[PDB]
C-alpha cells in the first residue's frame, strides 16, 4: 500500500532506529559519575589524576568513565540535578582539612546530607573522598578537632579524628538500605584513588546487575 | 561541490562484460540512494538500477535484471555497476543519480557527468506528444506530460518529476511531485496538473532554456521516462 | 538609600491599586453563563518510539506534521508524525539538553541545555546530513527555552535569570532582557513575535519588547517557580504553570491575573502549558505522568491525557490544531487527537 | 487437597505473566525467560487442576518448565559474570525471541518424536535432567562466587538467599525423578508409589517457579503492591 | 546597591503609566475569540475519521 517513496523513507527510518539502537548500546556500557563538592574541596585535584558542565572520559582496566562536573553550571541546583537520575555513581569531595574555619566541614555535611537523601539519588551510591589527609594531619596537631565537633570524645590523633569525620559523613544518609556509601583518603597520588573509583563502580554495577535479575 | 564522476566506458564487444564506476565527492554519500539512468545516443533517459541507502533494497529494469549488478562501497564513496553479457542495445550514456527520500525531501536531486558505454556491433507509460517546439526569448511555453496510470498517491503525493538536459549536458533536477522548485532553480519554472495529466510552465523563457524535458514518475518502479520535449530557437 | 526602598514600595502599591481598581468582574462571572465543554476524551493516536532517555522537550514544526524532540540520550529526533517515521537524528555535543526548537520556516532547529549554548542546526543542506549552524554562546547558565523569530534570529531563555535575543549569522547577542530575579525556566512568542513572556523561578512572569528590549509589564500571583508558559492565540494573554501546581491565566490588557486552574486532589508541579487552537483548552502537563485539559474560560477540568509512566515533561499542539504532542520522562513521545 | 497447590500456581502463574505484560515497559529482557517459563509453567499446572492429549501436552509443559530454568540461569549467569558488550551481543532483541522460541520447538519435538514412558526414553530423561540440574548449579554457583569476590575486594540482610532457595528446591523436586528414570533406567522394578510421588513433586516446582524467581525481585513486589494494597 | 535600587526604581515608574482595561472587558474579549474559534478547534470539536490525519 506504501508508495515507493514511503517504502524508501520507511527504510531510512528503520536505519536510523538501527544507529540509535547501537548508541544506546554503547551509552549502556559506560559509567557515569557525577562530581559533586562543596567547594575547593579537592574536585581539581581528583580531575587531574585522570562554560557550564565539564564532562571528563577516561578509560581504566577496558571500563569507560564519563564524569561530570557541574562546579561552574552557577544556578537554582533543584531545577537541573534531576538531569542526573540514573548516573552510575556520585563522587563527593570533601577537604578533610576544612574544619577550623570558615564551618566550612558543616557546609560540606550539609551538601552531602542534601545531596545523599535527594529524591532523585535514592539508589545511586556515593563515593566519598575526604582529600587533603597531610595538612589535615599537620593542621590536627596544632588546631584540636574540638572547633568543628564540640561533642566529639577522643585522642586528638590523625587516625581517630579521620575516623571520627568519615563516620559522620556515612551516618548523615538516611536510607541505607537502598544505597551505599564507599569512603577513601584521597591524597596517595599512587594511581589508588583511580583503582578504588574502578572499585566501587564495579560493586555498584554488580548490585544493579543483581537488582536487575531479582537477586538482591 | 557536490560532484558525482563516473569512470568505465568505452568500446566493448558484444557479449562481454564491465564495470562502470562512480566516485561521490561533497555530500553524505552512505545517506544518498542512488540510481543508474541511461540515455542511447539519439534517444531519452531510460532508468536501469537502484540501490537504496545501506545496500538493502535493490532494484533493476526488465531489460537489464539478471545481467547488470549494483553495488557501493559507502567507506569508498564509489558506486559500480557490473555489466555481464552486453549486448548492441546497452550502447549509450550511463549517469550517476543520487536520490535521498524522507518526508518533504528532493529526489534525482543532483545526477553525474555520465560515463559513454558502446558496443560494437505493467510499466507506467509517461508520453509527450510534443517532441519539439520552437520559443522564443521573452515568451511563455508549457510542456505537457501524460501518464497511463493516475500517479496520484492515497497519500496525498502526486509522483511526477520534471527534468531539464541542456545541450552537452546532464539532466538537471526541476519539479519533484509535481509542484515542487528543486533547490537553485528559478521561480519561472512552475508545475501543476492531476493525476496522468500534468504541465510543465515556463514564464518569461530565456537563453539557458533550450534542451529536452524529460518527465518521470517516481509513483513505483521500475521508473519510466516519457519521450521528451525539445526547445529550440 | 533606604529613600529609594521606600519609594520602590510605594510604587508597587501604586500600581497594585491600579490594577485593582480595574478587577470589577471576574472572568468566572463572566463565563459563567457559556456551556461548558462537556468532557474530552483524547486517544493515543501515535506513539514515537525511539528515544532512550528522558525527553525533556518538543516543538512542532509548523505545517503541523514534522516535530523535534529532545532527550538526554543525545540525539535529537524529527519526527514525521503522519508515519511515525524518523526523518533525522541529529547527535548533540552536549547530551544535557534542556530545551528544543523548530524555525517556523523549517530549515532549522535549536538545541540547548546544561551547556549554556544554543546550538542552531541546518536541516536542509546539499550534503545530505544536518550540520551545526552556529553555536551560541554568552549566557552564564543552562539553556531554558529558545524560539526562533525567523531564520535569523532566535529569544532564548537561561537559568542565568536573562533572556537574550541574538543574530544567528553573527552569533552575537543582540539584545539581553535583564529584569527577572530567578532562573528563566520558559518562553513564548506572541503571535506577532513583537514581544514575547518569560516565566522565572523568582514566581513572576514578565513582559518583553524584542524591538527595545524592555520588560514592558510583571506579572505575579504565583507561589513557586513558573516552569511553564504560553500565550494566548489571541496574543492578548498568556497562560503560566508553577511548581505550585496551579495553573493561571493572564491579561496584558488588564495587568492581573484572570483565573487560577487548581484542584485540592493536584499537589504537585506543572512542567509543561500550552492551548488549543481557539483557546478555549489549556493544556498542562504535570509530574502526575498524566496531562490534564482545563477549560480555559470555566477553569473545569474537561480531560485527563494519562499514557505516560513517567513525569510528562514537554507538551505541544499542532498549528492547525488538530492534534496534541506530550513528551514525558519515559522515552516515548504521544499524539492524541 | 494437593489439587489446592495446582491452584495456587496457576494463580501465582498468571499474576507474573499479567505483571509482565502490564509493565511490560518496565520489565527487561531478563524477565523474558522467566515468563517464558512461567507460561509453560501455567500449561502443567492447569492440566492438574480440577487423555493421551493431557499425557502429552504434559509432557511439553515440564520440557520447556526445565529448559526456562536453564535460559534464567544462564540468562543471569552472564549478565553478572560475562562483559556488558558480550552480554548485549548475545541477548538481542532477536536473539531473546529466538531462544524462546527454541525452547519451545525442542520441547514440542522431543515429546512427538519420542516413546512416552518416564529404556532409551529413561536413560535419555536422566542424562538430560543430570545436565540441565548441572547447568543449573554452575550458572548459579558462578553468580555467588563472582558476587562473593565482589564484596571481598570493596569491604577492605539475608543475601543471596535467593539463589539458595531456587537451587535448593530444584533438586529437592527434580532429584526424585531423575533417580526414578535412572531406576527405570535399567531392568528394575519401580512400585506405582514412588513413581506417582516423583512426578507430584517435579509438577509441584512449575507451582513455586514463578515465586522462586520473584519473590525476591523488588521491581515485583512493588508492582505487586500497587495492584494488590 | 544604590545603581541598583534607581534601576528597579525606574522599572516601576514604567510599570505604573501602563493604560489598563476593566476585567469584565478583557474577559470579555477571551470570550469573544473563543467562540469565532470555537468551530475552526478540533480538539473542542472531534472531527470524524474522514480528515483527521491521525486515524487508526
Ligand atoms: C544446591 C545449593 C546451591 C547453592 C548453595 C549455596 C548458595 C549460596 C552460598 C552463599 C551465599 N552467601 C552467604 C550467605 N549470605 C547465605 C548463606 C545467606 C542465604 C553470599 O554472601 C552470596 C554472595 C551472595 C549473593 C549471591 C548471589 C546473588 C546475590 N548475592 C548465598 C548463596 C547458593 C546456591
Ligand atoms: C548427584 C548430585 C548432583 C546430587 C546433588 C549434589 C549437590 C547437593 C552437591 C554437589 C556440589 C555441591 C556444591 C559444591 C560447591 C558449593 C559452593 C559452596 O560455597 C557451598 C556448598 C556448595 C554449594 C555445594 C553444595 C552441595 C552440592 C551442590
Ligand atoms: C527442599 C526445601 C523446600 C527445604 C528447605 C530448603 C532451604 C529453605 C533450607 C535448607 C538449608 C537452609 C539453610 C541452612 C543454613 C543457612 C545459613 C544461615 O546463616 C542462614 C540460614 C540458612 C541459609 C538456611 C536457610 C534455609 C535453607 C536454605
Ligand atoms: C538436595 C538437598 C536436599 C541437599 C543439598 C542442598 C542443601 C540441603 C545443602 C547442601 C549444601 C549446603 C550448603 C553448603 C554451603 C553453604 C555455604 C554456607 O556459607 C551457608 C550454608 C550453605 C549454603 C549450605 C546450605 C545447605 C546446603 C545448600
Given amino acids: 500500500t506504501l508508495s515507493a517513496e514511503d517504502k524508501a523513507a520507511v527504510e531510512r527510518s528503520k536505519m536510523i532506529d538501527r544507529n540509535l539502537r547501537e548508541d544506546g548500546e554503547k551509552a549502556a556500557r559506560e559509567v557515569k559519575l557525577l562530581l559533586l563538592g562543596a567547594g575547593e574541596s579537592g574536585k581539581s585535584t581528583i580531575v587531574k589524576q585522570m562554560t557550564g558542565i565539564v564532562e571528563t572520559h577516561f578509560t581504566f582496566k577496558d571500563l569507560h568513565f564519563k564524569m561530570f562536573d557541574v562546579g561552574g553550571q552557577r544556578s537554582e541546583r533543584k531545577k537541573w540535578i534531576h538531569c542526573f537520575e540514573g548516573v552510575t555513581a556520585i563522587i563527593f569531595c570533601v577537604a578533610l582539612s576544612d574544619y577550623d574555619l570558615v564551618n566550612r566541614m558543616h557546609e560540606s555535611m550539609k551538601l552531602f546530607d542534601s545531596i545523599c537523601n535527594n529524591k532523585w539519588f535514592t539508589d545511586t551510591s556515593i563515593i566519598l573522598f575526604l582529600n587533603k589527609k597531610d595538612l589535615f594531619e599537620e593542621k590536627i596537631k596544632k588546631s584540636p578537632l574540638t572547633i568543628c565537633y564540640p561533642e566529639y570524645a577522643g585522642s586528638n590523633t590523625y587516625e581517630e579524628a579521620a575516623a571520627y569525620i568519615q563516620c559522620q559523613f556515612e551516618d548523615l544518609n538516611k536510607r541505607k538500605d537502598t544505597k551505599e556509601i564507599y569512603t577513601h583518603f584521597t591524597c596517595a597520588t599512587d594511581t589508588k584513588n583511580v583503582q578504588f573509583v574502578f572499585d566501587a563502580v564495579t560493586d555498584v554495577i554488580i548490585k544493579n546487575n543483581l537488582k536487575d535479575c531479582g537477586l538482591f | 561541490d557536490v560532484q558525482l564522476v563516473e569512470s568505465g566506458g568505452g568500446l566493448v564487444q558484444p557479449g562481454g562484460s564491465r564495470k562502470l564506476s562512480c566516485s561521490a565527492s561533497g555530500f553524505a554519500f552512505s545517506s544518498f540512494g542512488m540510481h543508474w539512468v541511461r540515455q542511447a545516443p539519439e534517444k531519452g533517459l531510460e532508468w536501469v538500477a537502484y540501490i537504496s541507502s545501506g545496500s538493502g533494497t535493490i532494484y533493476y529494469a526488465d531489460t537489464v535484471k539478471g545481467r547488470f549488478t549494483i553495488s557501493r562501497d559507502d567507506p569508498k564513496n564509489t558506486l559500480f555497476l557490473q555489466m555481464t553479457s552486453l549486448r548492441s542495445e546497452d550502447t549509450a550514456m550511463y549517469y550517476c543519480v543520487r536520490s535521498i527520500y524522507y518526508y518533504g525531501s528532493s529526489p534525482f536531486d543532483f545526477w553525474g557527468q555520465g560515463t559513454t558505454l558502446t558496443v560494437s556491433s505493467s510499466d507506467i507509460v509517461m508520453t509527450q506528444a510534443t517532441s519539439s517546439v520552437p520559443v522564443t526569448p521573452g515568451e511563455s511555453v508549457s510542456i505537457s506530460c501524460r501518464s497511463s496510470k493516475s500517479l496520484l498517491h492515497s497519500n496525498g503525493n502526486t509522483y511526477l518529476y520534471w527534468f531539464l538536459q541542456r545541450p552537452g549536458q546532464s539532466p538537471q533536477l526541476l519539479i519533484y511531485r509535481m509542484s515542487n522548485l528543486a533547490s537553485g532553480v528559478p521561480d519561472r519554472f512552475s508545475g501543476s496538473g492531476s493525476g496522468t495529466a500534468f504541465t510543465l510552465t515556463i514564464s518569461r523563457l530565456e537563453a539557458e532554456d533550450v534542451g529536452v524535458y524529460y518527465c518521470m514518475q517516481h509513483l513505483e518502479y521500475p521508473l519510466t521516462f516519457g519521450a521528451g520535449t525539445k526547445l529550440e530557437l | 538609600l533606604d529613600q529609594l526602598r521606600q519609594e520602590a514600595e510605594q510604587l508597587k502599591n501604586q500600581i497594585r491599586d491600579a490594577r485593582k481598581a480595574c478587577a470589577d468582574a471576574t472572568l468566572s462571572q463572566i463565563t459563567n453563563n457559556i456551556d461548558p465543554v462537556g468532557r474530552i476524551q483524547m486517544r493515543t493516536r501515535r506513539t514515537l518510539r525511539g528515544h532512550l532517555a528522558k525527553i525533556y522537550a518538543m516543538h512542532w514544526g509548523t505545517d503541523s506534521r514534522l516535530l523535534v524532540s529532545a532527550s538526554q540520550d543525545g540525539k535529537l529526533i524529527i519526527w514525521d508524525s503522519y508515519t511515525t517515521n524518523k526523518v533525522h537524528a541529529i547527535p548533540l555535543r552536549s547530551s544535557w539538553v534542556m530545551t528544543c526548537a523548530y524555525a517556523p520556516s523549517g530549515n532549522y532547529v535549536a538545541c540547548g541545555g546544561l551547556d549554556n549554548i544554543c546550538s542552531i542546526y541546518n536541516l536542509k543542506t546539499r550534503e545530505g546530513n544536518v550540520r551545526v549552524s552556529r553555536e551560541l554562546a554568552g549566557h552564564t547558565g543552562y539553556l531554558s527555552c529558545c524560539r526562533f523569530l525567523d531564520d535569523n534570529q532566535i529569544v532564548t531563555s537561561s537559568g542565568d535569570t536573562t533572556c537574550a535575543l541574538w543574530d544567528i549569522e553573527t552569533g552575537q547577542q543582540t539584545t539581553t532582557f535583564t529584569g527577572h530575579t530567578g532562573d528563566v525556566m520558559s518562553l513564548s512568542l506572541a503571535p506577532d513575535t513583537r514581544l514575547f513572556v518569560s516565566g522565572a523561578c523568582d514566581a513572576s512572569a514578565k513582559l518583553w519588547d524584542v524591538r527595545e528590549g524592555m520588560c514592558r509589564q510583571t506579572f505575579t500571583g504565583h507561589e513557586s517557580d513558573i516552569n511553564a508558559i504560553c500565550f494566548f492565540p489571541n496574543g492578548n494573554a498568556f497562560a503560566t504553570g508553577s511548581d505550585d501546581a496551579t495553573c493561571r491565566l493572564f491579561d496584558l490588557r488588564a495587568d492581573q491575573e484572570l483565573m487560577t486552574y487548581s484542584h485540592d486532589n493536584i499537589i504537585c508541579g506543572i512542567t509543561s502549558v500550552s492551548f488549543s487552537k481557539s483557546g478555549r483548552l489549556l493544556l498542562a502537563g504535570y509530574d502526575d505522568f498524566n496531562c490534564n485539559v482545563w477549560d480555559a474560560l470555566k477553569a473545569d477540568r474537561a480531560g485527563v491525557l494519562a499514557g505516560h509512566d513517567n513525569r510528562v515533561s514537554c507538551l505541544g499542539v499542532t498549528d492547525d490544531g488538530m492534534a496534541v504532542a506530550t513528551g514525558s520522562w519515559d522515552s516515548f513521545l504521544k499524539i492524541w487527537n | 487437597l494437593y489439587s489446592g497447590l495446582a491452584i495456587g500456581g496457576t494463580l501465582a502463574n498468571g499474576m507474573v505473566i499479567y505483571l509482565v505484560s502490564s509493565f511490560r515497559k518496565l520489565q527487561t529482557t531478563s524477565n523474558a525467560f522467566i515468563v517464558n517459563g512461567c507460561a509453560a509453567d501455567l500449561s502443567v499446572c492447569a492440566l492438574w487442576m480440577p487423555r493421551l492429549l493431557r499425557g502429552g501436552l504434559l509432557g511439553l509443559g515440564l520440557t520447556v518448565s526445565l529448559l526456562s530454568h536453564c535460559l534464567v540461569a544462564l540468562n543471569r549467569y552472564l549478565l553478572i559474570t560475562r562483559a556488558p558488550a558480550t552480554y548485549q551481543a548475545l541477548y538481542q532483541r532477536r536473539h531473546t525471541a529466538g531462544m524462546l522460541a527454541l525452547s519451545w520447538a525442542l520441547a514440542l519435538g522431543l515429546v512427538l518424536l519420542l516413546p512416552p514412558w518416564a529404556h532409551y526414553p529413561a536413560l535419555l530423561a536422566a542424562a538430560a535432567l543430570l545436565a540441565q540440574t548441572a547447568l543449573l548449579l554452575h550458572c548459579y554457583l558462578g553468580i555467588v562466587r563472582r558476587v562473593r569476590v565482589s564484596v571481598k575486594r570493596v569491604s577492605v540482610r539475608l543475601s543471596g538467599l535467593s539463589v539458595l532457595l531456587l537451587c535448593c528446591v530444584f533438586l529437592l523436586a527434580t532429584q526424585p525423578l531423575v533417580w526414578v528414570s535412572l531406576a527405570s533406567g535399567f531392568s528394575l522394578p519401580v512400585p506405582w508409589g514412588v513413581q506417582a510421588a516423583s512426578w507430584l513433586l517435579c509438577c509441584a516446582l512449575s507451582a513455586l517457579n514463578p515465586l522462586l524467581y520473584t519473590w525476591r525481585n523488588e521491581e515485583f513486589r512493588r508492582s505487586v503492591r500497587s495492584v494488590l494494597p | ?56
Fill in chain 5, 1 to 56: 546597591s544604590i545603581a541598583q535600587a534607581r534601576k528597579l526604581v525606574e522599572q516601576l515608574k514604567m510599570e505604573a503609566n501602563i493604560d489598563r482595561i476593566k476585567v469584565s472587558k478583557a474577559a470579555a474579549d477571551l470570550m469573544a475569540y473563543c467562540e469565532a474559534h470555537a468551530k475552526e478547534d478540533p480538539l473542542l470539536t472531534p472531527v470524524p475519521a474522514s480528515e483527521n490525519p491521525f486515524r487508526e
